[PDB]
Amino acid sequence: TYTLVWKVWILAVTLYYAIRIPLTLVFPSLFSPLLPLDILASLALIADIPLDLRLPDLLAALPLDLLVFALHLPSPLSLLSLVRLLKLISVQASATRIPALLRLLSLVGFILLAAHGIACGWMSLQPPSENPAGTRYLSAFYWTITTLTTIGYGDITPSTPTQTVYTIVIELLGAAMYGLVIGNIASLVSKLDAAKLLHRERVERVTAFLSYKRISPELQRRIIEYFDYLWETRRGYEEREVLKELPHPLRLAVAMEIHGDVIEKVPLFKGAGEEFIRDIILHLEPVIYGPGEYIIRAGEMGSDVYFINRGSVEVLSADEKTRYAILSEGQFFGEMALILRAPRTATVRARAFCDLYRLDKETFDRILSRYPEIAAQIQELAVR
Amino acid sequence: TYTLVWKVWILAVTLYYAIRIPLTLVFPSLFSPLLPLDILASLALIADIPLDLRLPDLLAALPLDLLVFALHLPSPLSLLSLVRLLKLISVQASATRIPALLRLLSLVGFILLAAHGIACGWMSLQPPSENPAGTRYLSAFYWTITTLTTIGYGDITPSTPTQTVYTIVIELLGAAMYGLVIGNIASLVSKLDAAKLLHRERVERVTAFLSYKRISPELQRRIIEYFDYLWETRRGYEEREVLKELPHPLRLAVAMEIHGDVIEKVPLFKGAGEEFIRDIILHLEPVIYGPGEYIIRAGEMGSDVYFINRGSVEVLSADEKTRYAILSEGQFFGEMALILRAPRTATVRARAFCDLYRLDKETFDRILSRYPEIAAQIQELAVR
Amino acid sequence: TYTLVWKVWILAVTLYYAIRIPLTLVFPSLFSPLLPLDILASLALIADIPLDLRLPDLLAALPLDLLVFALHLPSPLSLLSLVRLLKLISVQASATRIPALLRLLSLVGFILLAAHGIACGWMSLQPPSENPAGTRYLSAFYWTITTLTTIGYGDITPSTPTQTVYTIVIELLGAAMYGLVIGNIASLVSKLDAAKLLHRERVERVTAFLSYKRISPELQRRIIEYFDYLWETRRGYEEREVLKELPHPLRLAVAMEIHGDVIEKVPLFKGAGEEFIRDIILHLEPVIYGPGEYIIRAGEMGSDVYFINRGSVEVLSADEKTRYAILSEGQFFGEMALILRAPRTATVRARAFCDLYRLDKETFDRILSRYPEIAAQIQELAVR
Amino acid sequence: TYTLVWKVWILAVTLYYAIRIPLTLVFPSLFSPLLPLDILASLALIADIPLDLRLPDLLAALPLDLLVFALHLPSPLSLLSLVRLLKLISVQASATRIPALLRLLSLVGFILLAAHGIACGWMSLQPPSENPAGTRYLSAFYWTITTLTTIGYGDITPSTPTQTVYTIVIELLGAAMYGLVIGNIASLVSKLDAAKLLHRERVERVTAFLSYKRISPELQRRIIEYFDYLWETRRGYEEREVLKELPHPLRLAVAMEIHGDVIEKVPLFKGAGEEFIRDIILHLEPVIYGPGEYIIRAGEMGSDVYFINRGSVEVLSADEKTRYAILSEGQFFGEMALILRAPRTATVRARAFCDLYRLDKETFDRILSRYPEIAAQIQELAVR
Ligand SMILES: Nc1ncnc2c1ncn2[C@@H]1O[C@@H]2COP(=O)(O)O[C@H]2[C@H]1O
Ligand SMILES: Nc1ncnc2c1ncn2[C@@H]1O[C@@H]2COP(=O)(O)O[C@H]2[C@H]1O
Ligand SMILES: Nc1ncnc2c1ncn2[C@@H]1O[C@@H]2COP(=O)(O)O[C@H]2[C@H]1O
Ligand SMILES: Nc1ncnc2c1ncn2[C@@H]1O[C@@H]2COP(=O)(O)O[C@H]2[C@H]1O
């Protein structure tokens, strides 16, 4: 769009004023050559009220400048020129509508602008000396960053009672600002990148107690390695415990957008209409299995239907001998447990860290009854 | 009322003593013209015990003043005059019975009062010099705020062993107070305005993981925009997960007070007695639907009765053609699913971010059986 | 007992050594008159190993003293005399087996002892001057508390390269200790008195959102006043949500100890055996009702039996007229709903913030069937 | 393995460069005798790219050294020699793949290396003086640790405008680093050893409220002593509330590995196949009972089967007289409640803090029906 360029340009204009207006307060030698750059900035700043898509904007937009330094408006009553900086609140509020920027750019940039302003103010109540403005500005900012950040050298100290009063309030405000921002950043880096901080402690607690006990090396592996698979394939995250709070039509939408891998590639899941993909993809619950891991033994009960998405798993006999075959992508098994109401003849292991989807049984038999075509689709692969 | 004026006036009196009594300790030149303002303050402070609707009040109310400085009661035994400031505990406790004031006014104001008192105390053990009291007070407060806030210039340093002992304990206590208050405020601004801090992180976690995955732009919208609707219409808040802990008669009262919009404007909900509004307004569960969002397809099961409060939704045929009509405020639909025990003929979308109330079915059929009049009221709109 | 006196006396002995041994290192003028007080302390410290009801105790108990300063054991090899202070670990561990003391006395006392020790150490590598030991000790502790607490005056600075090396490590260690303890206390006062901090925020969140909405003044009261009743009678606390984690025999024991008020004062609950008081006092669930609050209307269903412990409640007719009677302490009602299987004729309000116990119905009818005597006890008051 | 030695040697090489390269920048007198030790380090650093099991490694591996100081490559363009230290990111990332090291060695070691580097840099923009390099290095590091750790002596101050500019940015960066690391460590020690910190507060809350009430001394004991048994035998930990998040095959594996004590030592649990130990060891729920604690009275209902692992419990009559016998390790009781469908004749107490396993009943009767052999194994001990 084009309006973001307008926001960044008005931001630049407000920074221009925040750097220049205190300098013009201290140095009346300015504002004489800058009048074109001042009138353009003033017209830009006054041409912003009606763009809604208001007190600070109205207070800053009144043309108090071009008069403060022209009519020369003596110093005790010229301190009302600072009301032009109240656009800081508006721009900080709008900076959210554009932890990297909430408490980072709104804090260190504010600290720098405030430091510049207060160094210029501390420059103002000094006796008129004979030194270059640049080196005096560096010295003033040096003293300012010394007392604002709580260092305390003391090579520059107040001498007049009015400067001693000013240094009381600047000491208080600066050590408040320093402590505030530093404590905020310290409490925020303990929240920054909250995925590695929360998840790694999730691993720490479990690991800690299982290593308080003693566990075999071939079970020490696959524990830290299941956390590694959940750290690399899933990046420290289970899914369902975080997706309850998202609404029911929103679990429908997010789940049909995300679980696009399992559906419309196996002949069961392609061409299966639409009331499935809303009804069952929320019930589509994934699990992860490691290498050489058993699920069923010979003839157990409650053997739900196993939908393999990717990965190859061998099927063998009840014993280790007489290799049957390989089952791989694009197919499924596990179905003649409930449709045939019969005990089972199957043995399963896994080659590697395989992903397999495990859905419940009562909803399965509830929904297959409402659909002759796809229960028949199950049925030919059941019978042949 | 009038008693709050009495609390603020006694607060002013205690501040008056906290500022003045150390000054009279250091400067015996006072207390001579202030005797009217001292007797009125003393009578006001002693006329507060019986107003219950007690150790600090009794200890402060004893007339030790008007004698400490009259009989002149030499300095080592005059330090018991400080027992009059123990009303600080009482006023700080009562300040709750009147995070903007719990750890803000009880901390910075306490810091300022303590700073004044300890600067006056540090003034006390100085050699008698020849300087104005005002500039010496500013210098003493300057050194105090220098060492209390941990800056460390060093232009003013102790010289006598007794002053070196006093500066040990004031250094310890001041750096304790500084660290305490600054760490408290730093940990409190991470709790201050806890709605934007908690909710924005609620958005952050979800957004973070859904953007760790990749989601379509027309589904990137309505996610952040559902959070925007929950941030502007609801201000970052779901309702039921926070209202369990409120008691059952209190969910009755709060819910009948709050959900006054849905009831007594549709002819179902007006004139419907009272045992409804207690029985069902807790079961009145709201949901939000975005533009162009489906709910039902053609003839599904379990189509509960839809109560639309505000907003207009179109009804069309099973296909996109042959526009039926507009359904809008003041009415309802969704009813012939359970009363007629029949499949459905309806298609629904939404124009915008519409609010719709979704209540359960088993309680509905439980309560409609106990009420002939209002099930009949449902029935004419069902039949005609 | 007597052994706690022994622990406090050995604690005093360890403090005696921690204060005195560095002084004897710096000042060899000591240890000459203190030999009785040294031999008694040594015999007390060596007579502590066998009292189990061990490395630091054994390392401290070896008689290296009485030889370090007698044979004079030149200074570079005399630094092993500090191994006697390792009883600090043992006493800090035992201080739990005796937030007011876990991170308070183990931190500020440790800071003070460490400060004393390191000030004496900084005294050790100084050129031999001619000043009183007291004022030099105050000056050394002054510099120490200046650099340990990060103040930085600079009136005392290192001059020799070895003192510059020592001040590097003491600066590092002292600013580590200062930051550690101050951040710990700042994070602990945000946990200190965790009942007012957790509960008041519990009130804050609810109050905040109900005042984000608008609620009537006669419902603004009884909300904050129900929190006041839960803050004064219960002190910010519900009961059952915290007593699940306590085990089942332990809910039996704690509940029969605590709920001694409701039982054995009404004729139902006295003389009722024992298998009740274990079976039902966990199911004894309390609720609180405010003034003038309705529960039932005329003839509703599911009117469980109401056990009033204390407080008087009026019973009136279905309308406001024809006052029936007062029901008060020592009795109960609510019973002919389930035993007679009949609709109800009752109206109830409450005079004030009354406490009433509400138990479930299925367990009630399960247990009354196993007990003829007490269901009969219910029965006469039901029938007469 | 051998590759960890390679990582520690390359770590030593990177530390060698981080200490030496700034010194060679400041002191061109080096690099002349070190050429063998420089060529070996360079060949080691360039022989690390292909060992995957990449921008910093490639940028550091380019042979910019051996030319920077040979061709003498004048000072303003020689600052690109610092790009060799970017292996810090790689080694800090790999330090996790090898709270004692996450935010401890990555922070204090980084602080020390940064301090050395910035002290050498501050040495660089000094006028050429005539002092030994060692004492000047100590003085520079002294000033650096003074301003980096926010102490502020002031014996060494900048004089040139360029040094004043450098001290502005080093003051800012150093007080940022100091505050960051110290606040991080302060917030981490409140998380460090999170077992004693979390559990002791678990004890604190309960103890606090039960001591807000008043509880008998023989019930004050066994409360703190049940927490002591859970603190010494279990180390502040219940089991099931933390093992839900571990997956179902993983509760199978972890539970069969951990609960190896109860199984295969009583004749019930040995030789019982395998589908038990997966089916019931997750349902194997442990409880702890203290001395002299009742469970059943005479003839109650729902007396599940009691599996005693270790400890001896007496059985007596319904009254205190006529001692029956001792029941001890290797056996079980509690079985004729459900198999015989009969009321009970038993009384039980406990000698000490005994561990007993309590499993549910519906799964027990569900699984015993599928197993004739082991229900018969139950049956002979039931009948004889
Ligand atoms: N001849 C065969 N060789 C290998 N696998 C088979 C064979 N016949 C059937 N199967 C699969 O083995 C599975 C075991 O029973 P299921 O119900 O899981 O579904 C079964 C089929 O998918
Ligand atoms: N002729 C019509 N045109 C538009 N809407 C209708 C018409 N007749 C009924 N409806 C509504 O359409 C809804 C679809 O079925 P419901 O049970 O939800 O309730 C129905 C009625 O409220
Ligand atoms: N004559 C009466 N006057 C006042 N209260 C009564 C009278 N008779 C019965 N009650 C009580 O009124 C209660 C209303 O029905 P309950 O089942 O709650 O138990 C009833 C009795 O305890
Ligand atoms: N003669 C006996 N002396 C002691 N204990 C017995 C005797 N006979 C049975 N028991 C045990 O007492 C227990 C009480 O009933 P249970 O069903 O718990 O299982 C019973 C047996 O294990």
Short mmCIF file of C-alpha atoms in Angstrom, two decimals, chain D residues 55-354:
data_model
loop_
_atom_site.label_atom_id
_atom_site.label_comp_id
_atom_site.label_asym_id
_atom_site.label_seq_id
_atom_site.Cartn_x
_atom_site.Cartn_y
_atom_site.Cartn_z
CA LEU D 55 28.33 -18.77 7.13
CA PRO D 56 30.48 -18.15 10.28
CA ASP D 57 32.78 -21.08 9.50
CA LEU D 58 33.29 -19.99 5.89
CA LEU D 59 33.85 -16.35 6.88
CA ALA D 60 36.38 -17.32 9.57
CA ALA D 61 38.17 -19.90 7.40
CA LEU D 62 39.32 -17.44 4.72
CA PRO D 63 43.08 -16.77 5.20
CA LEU D 64 42.88 -13.06 5.99
CA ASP D 65 45.48 -13.57 8.73
CA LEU D 66 49.15 -14.16 7.80
CA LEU D 67 48.45 -11.16 5.53
CA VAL D 68 46.90 -8.55 7.86
CA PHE D 69 50.13 -8.26 9.86
CA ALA D 70 52.63 -9.22 7.11
CA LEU D 71 51.56 -6.73 4.41
CA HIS D 72 50.72 -4.50 7.44
CA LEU D 73 47.36 -3.53 5.85
CA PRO D 74 46.89 -0.11 7.55
CA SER D 75 44.78 0.20 10.67
CA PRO D 76 41.38 1.60 9.44
CA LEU D 77 40.91 -1.39 7.09
CA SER D 78 42.37 -3.97 9.52
CA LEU D 79 39.23 -4.05 11.70
CA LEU D 80 37.80 -6.76 9.42
CA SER D 81 40.17 -9.20 11.17
CA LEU D 82 37.50 -9.60 13.88
CA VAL D 83 35.28 -11.76 11.63
CA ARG D 84 37.21 -14.82 12.82
CA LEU D 85 35.42 -14.82 16.21
CA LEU D 86 31.99 -15.67 14.75
CA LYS D 87 32.60 -19.34 15.68
CA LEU D 88 31.24 -18.24 19.09
CA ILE D 89 27.69 -18.65 17.74
CA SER D 90 28.43 -22.14 16.42
CA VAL D 91 30.12 -23.34 19.62
CA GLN D 92 27.37 -21.85 21.82
CA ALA D 93 24.75 -23.63 19.71
CA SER D 94 26.73 -26.89 19.85
CA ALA D 95 27.24 -26.54 23.63
CA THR D 96 23.64 -27.74 24.02
CA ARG D 97 24.40 -30.84 21.90
CA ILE D 98 27.06 -32.33 24.17
CA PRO D 99 20.73 -24.74 34.23
CA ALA D 100 24.40 -25.53 34.87
CA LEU D 101 25.51 -24.68 31.32
CA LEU D 102 22.64 -23.09 29.35
CA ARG D 103 22.83 -19.62 30.95
CA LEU D 104 25.99 -20.03 33.07
CA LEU D 105 28.93 -20.92 30.80
CA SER D 106 27.36 -19.07 27.86
CA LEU D 107 27.16 -15.89 29.99
CA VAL D 108 30.10 -15.50 32.39
CA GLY D 109 32.57 -16.85 29.82
CA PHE D 110 31.09 -14.55 27.18
CA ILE D 111 31.37 -11.66 29.66
CA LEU D 112 35.04 -12.44 30.33
CA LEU D 113 35.93 -12.78 26.63
CA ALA D 114 34.04 -9.59 25.77
CA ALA D 115 35.75 -7.79 28.67
CA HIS D 116 39.19 -8.84 27.41
CA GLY D 117 38.36 -7.77 23.86
CA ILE D 118 36.94 -4.40 24.83
CA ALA D 119 39.83 -3.68 27.20
CA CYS D 120 42.24 -4.35 24.32
CA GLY D 121 40.13 -2.09 22.12
CA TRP D 122 40.18 0.68 24.71
CA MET D 123 43.95 0.19 24.84
CA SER D 124 44.10 0.78 21.09
CA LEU D 125 43.02 4.47 20.99
CA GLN D 126 45.48 5.69 23.64
CA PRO D 127 48.50 7.96 23.14
CA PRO D 128 51.74 5.95 22.97
CA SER D 129 53.14 5.96 26.51
CA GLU D 130 56.25 4.39 28.08
CA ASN D 131 55.08 1.68 30.48
CA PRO D 132 55.31 -2.13 30.57
CA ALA D 133 52.64 -3.92 28.55
CA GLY D 134 51.63 -6.09 31.51
CA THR D 135 50.86 -3.27 33.94
CA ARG D 136 49.13 -1.25 31.20
CA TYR D 137 47.00 -4.30 30.38
CA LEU D 138 46.06 -4.64 34.05
CA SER D 139 45.20 -0.92 34.21
CA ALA D 140 43.09 -1.13 31.04
CA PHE D 141 41.23 -4.21 32.28
CA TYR D 142 40.77 -2.45 35.63
CA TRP D 143 39.08 0.54 33.97
CA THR D 144 37.08 -1.83 31.76
CA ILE D 145 35.73 -3.95 34.63
CA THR D 146 35.05 -0.66 36.47
CA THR D 147 32.83 0.73 33.71
CA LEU D 148 31.39 -2.57 32.38
CA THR D 149 30.14 -3.64 35.83
CA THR D 150 28.82 -0.15 36.80
CA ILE D 151 31.08 0.77 39.71
CA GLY D 152 32.39 4.21 38.74
CA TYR D 153 35.63 5.13 40.51
CA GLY D 154 36.80 7.70 37.97
CA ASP D 155 40.58 7.55 38.45
CA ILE D 156 40.83 6.90 34.69
CA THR D 157 38.75 9.16 32.46
CA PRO D 158 38.63 9.89 28.72
CA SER D 159 40.30 13.06 27.47
CA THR D 160 40.04 13.11 23.65
CA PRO D 161 36.69 13.53 21.83
CA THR D 162 37.15 10.17 20.09
CA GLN D 163 37.76 8.42 23.42
CA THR D 164 34.70 10.23 24.79
CA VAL D 165 32.67 8.83 21.89
CA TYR D 166 34.04 5.35 22.51
CA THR D 167 33.26 5.54 26.22
CA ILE D 168 29.65 6.51 25.44
CA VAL D 169 29.01 3.31 23.50
CA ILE D 170 31.05 1.13 25.84
CA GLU D 171 29.16 2.57 28.84
CA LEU D 172 25.84 1.81 27.15
CA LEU D 173 26.81 -1.69 26.00
CA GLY D 174 28.53 -2.61 29.27
CA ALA D 175 25.66 -1.52 31.50
CA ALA D 176 23.31 -3.37 29.16
CA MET D 177 25.40 -6.53 29.45
CA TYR D 178 25.79 -6.20 33.23
CA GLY D 179 22.08 -5.63 33.81
CA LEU D 180 21.13 -8.39 31.36
CA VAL D 181 23.34 -11.10 32.86
CA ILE D 182 22.70 -10.13 36.49
CA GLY D 183 18.92 -10.00 36.03
CA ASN D 184 19.07 -13.28 34.11
CA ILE D 185 20.99 -14.99 36.91
CA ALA D 186 18.69 -13.47 39.55
CA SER D 187 15.61 -14.77 37.73
CA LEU D 188 17.36 -18.11 37.17
CA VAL D 189 18.36 -18.82 40.76
CA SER D 190 14.68 -18.40 41.56
CA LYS D 191 14.32 -21.22 39.00
CA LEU D 192 17.60 -23.03 39.79
CA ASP D 193 17.16 -26.39 41.55
CA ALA D 194 13.45 -26.09 40.71
CA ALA D 195 12.63 -29.25 42.71
CA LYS D 196 13.36 -27.76 46.14
CA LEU D 197 11.91 -24.38 45.07
CA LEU D 198 8.67 -25.80 43.64
CA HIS D 199 8.17 -28.59 46.17
CA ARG D 200 9.03 -26.61 49.31
CA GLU D 201 6.42 -24.04 48.24
CA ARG D 202 4.00 -26.92 47.75
CA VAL D 203 4.57 -27.83 51.39
CA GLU D 204 4.47 -24.16 52.39
CA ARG D 205 0.99 -23.43 51.04
CA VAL D 206 -0.62 -26.49 52.66
CA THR D 207 1.29 -26.18 55.96
CA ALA D 208 0.46 -22.46 56.00
CA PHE D 209 -3.28 -22.95 55.83
CA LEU D 210 -3.44 -25.99 58.13
CA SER D 211 -1.46 -23.93 60.66
CA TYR D 212 -3.78 -20.99 60.06
CA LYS D 213 -6.26 -23.48 61.47
CA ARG D 214 -5.32 -25.43 64.60
CA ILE D 215 -4.55 -29.14 64.31
CA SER D 216 -3.68 -31.63 67.03
CA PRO D 217 -0.01 -32.50 67.75
CA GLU D 218 -0.56 -36.16 66.85
CA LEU D 219 -2.03 -34.89 63.57
CA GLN D 220 0.58 -32.16 63.13
CA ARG D 221 2.85 -35.17 63.01
CA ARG D 222 2.17 -37.49 60.02
CA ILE D 223 1.32 -34.37 57.99
CA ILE D 224 4.83 -32.90 57.96
CA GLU D 225 6.01 -36.49 58.29
CA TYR D 226 4.05 -37.61 55.23
CA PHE D 227 5.72 -34.71 53.43
CA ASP D 228 9.03 -35.98 54.87
CA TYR D 229 8.36 -39.48 53.53
CA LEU D 230 7.45 -37.91 50.18
CA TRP D 231 10.64 -35.81 50.47
CA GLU D 232 13.03 -38.68 51.31
CA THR D 233 11.51 -41.76 49.63
CA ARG D 234 9.97 -39.85 46.70
CA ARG D 235 11.86 -36.51 46.90
CA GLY D 236 8.86 -34.21 46.76
CA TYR D 237 6.88 -35.86 43.99
CA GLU D 238 3.67 -37.63 43.11
CA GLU D 239 3.79 -39.77 39.99
CA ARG D 240 0.59 -39.96 37.95
CA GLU D 241 -0.12 -36.20 37.66
CA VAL D 242 3.20 -35.84 35.79
CA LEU D 243 3.06 -39.00 33.65
CA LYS D 244 -0.13 -38.25 31.65
CA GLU D 245 1.74 -36.15 29.09
CA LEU D 246 4.09 -39.07 28.33
CA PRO D 247 2.48 -41.16 25.53
CA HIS D 248 0.56 -44.40 26.03
CA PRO D 249 3.23 -46.81 24.67
CA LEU D 250 5.66 -44.66 26.63
CA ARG D 251 3.73 -45.04 29.88
CA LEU D 252 3.84 -48.78 29.01
CA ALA D 253 7.62 -48.77 28.61
CA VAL D 254 8.49 -46.40 31.47
CA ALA D 255 6.10 -48.12 33.87
CA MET D 256 7.33 -51.64 33.10
CA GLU D 257 10.90 -50.40 33.54
CA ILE D 258 10.21 -48.58 36.82
CA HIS D 259 7.67 -50.80 38.59
CA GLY D 260 9.96 -53.83 38.45
CA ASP D 261 9.72 -54.22 42.24
CA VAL D 262 6.06 -55.21 42.63
CA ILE D 263 6.08 -57.71 39.73
CA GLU D 264 7.81 -61.15 39.32
CA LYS D 265 8.44 -61.71 43.06
CA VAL D 266 4.97 -62.61 44.34
CA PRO D 267 3.67 -65.88 42.78
CA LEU D 268 0.74 -63.96 41.31
CA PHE D 269 3.00 -61.60 39.37
CA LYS D 270 5.68 -64.08 38.25
CA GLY D 271 5.03 -66.33 35.28
CA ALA D 272 1.92 -64.30 34.44
CA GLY D 273 2.65 -63.73 30.78
CA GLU D 274 3.04 -60.32 29.17
CA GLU D 275 -0.36 -58.81 28.33
CA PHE D 276 -0.88 -58.21 32.04
CA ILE D 277 2.32 -56.25 32.57
CA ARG D 278 1.38 -53.88 29.76
CA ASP D 279 -2.32 -53.71 30.72
CA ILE D 280 -2.17 -53.26 34.51
CA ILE D 281 1.14 -51.58 35.40
CA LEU D 282 -0.27 -48.27 34.18
CA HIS D 283 -3.30 -48.99 36.38
CA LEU D 284 -0.89 -49.90 39.22
CA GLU D 285 -1.49 -46.85 41.42
CA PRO D 286 0.57 -46.48 44.63
CA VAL D 287 -0.45 -44.96 47.96
CA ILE D 288 1.39 -44.42 51.24
CA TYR D 289 -0.02 -45.15 54.70
CA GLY D 290 1.38 -44.01 58.03
CA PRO D 291 1.71 -45.87 61.33
CA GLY D 292 -1.46 -47.09 63.03
CA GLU D 293 -3.80 -45.94 60.26
CA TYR D 294 -7.17 -47.55 59.59
CA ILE D 295 -8.49 -48.51 56.15
CA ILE D 296 -11.53 -50.73 56.80
CA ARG D 297 -13.61 -51.28 59.93
CA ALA D 298 -15.46 -54.63 60.00
CA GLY D 299 -17.68 -55.50 57.06
CA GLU D 300 -17.76 -52.57 54.64
CA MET D 301 -18.40 -52.73 50.90
CA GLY D 302 -15.99 -52.14 48.04
CA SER D 303 -12.92 -53.75 49.63
CA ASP D 304 -10.53 -54.00 46.70
CA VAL D 305 -7.62 -56.44 46.65
CA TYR D 306 -4.59 -55.21 48.61
CA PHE D 307 -1.12 -55.88 47.15
CA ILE D 308 1.57 -55.41 49.81
CA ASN D 309 5.08 -55.07 48.37
CA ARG D 310 7.22 -54.46 51.47
CA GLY D 311 6.38 -54.01 55.13
CA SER D 312 4.59 -56.08 57.78
CA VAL D 313 1.00 -55.37 58.85
CA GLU D 314 -0.87 -57.11 61.67
CA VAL D 315 -4.40 -58.50 61.36
CA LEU D 316 -6.62 -58.50 64.45
CA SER D 317 -10.26 -59.22 65.26
CA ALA D 318 -13.13 -56.73 65.06
CA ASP D 319 -12.11 -55.71 68.59
CA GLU D 320 -8.60 -55.09 69.90
CA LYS D 321 -8.33 -58.57 71.46
CA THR D 322 -7.50 -62.00 69.93
CA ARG D 323 -4.51 -61.31 67.69
CA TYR D 324 -4.86 -63.23 64.41
CA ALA D 325 -1.51 -63.11 62.58
CA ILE D 326 1.16 -61.13 60.68
CA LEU D 327 0.95 -60.45 56.94
CA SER D 328 4.20 -59.48 55.27
CA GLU D 329 6.23 -59.44 52.06
CA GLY D 330 5.58 -61.75 49.12
CA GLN D 331 1.82 -62.17 49.61
CA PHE D 332 -1.49 -60.32 49.18
CA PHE D 333 -5.04 -60.16 50.52
CA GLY D 334 -8.31 -58.30 49.95
CA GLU D 335 -9.71 -60.68 47.34
CA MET D 336 -12.87 -62.41 48.65
CA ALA D 337 -14.87 -59.15 48.52
CA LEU D 338 -15.71 -59.33 44.80
CA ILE D 339 -15.14 -62.97 43.81
CA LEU D 340 -17.35 -64.30 46.64
CA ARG D 341 -19.77 -61.31 46.51
CA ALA D 342 -19.80 -61.34 50.31
CA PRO D 343 -19.32 -58.88 53.19
CA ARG D 344 -15.98 -58.65 54.91
CA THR D 345 -14.33 -59.78 58.18
CA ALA D 346 -11.05 -57.88 58.52
CA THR D 347 -9.26 -55.16 60.48
CA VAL D 348 -6.02 -53.54 59.31
CA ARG D 349 -3.45 -51.12 60.71
CA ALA D 350 0.10 -50.22 59.68
CA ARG D 351 3.36 -50.40 61.63
CA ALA D 352 5.16 -47.53 59.89
CA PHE D 353 5.24 -45.47 56.68
CA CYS D 354 4.25 -48.41 54.50
#
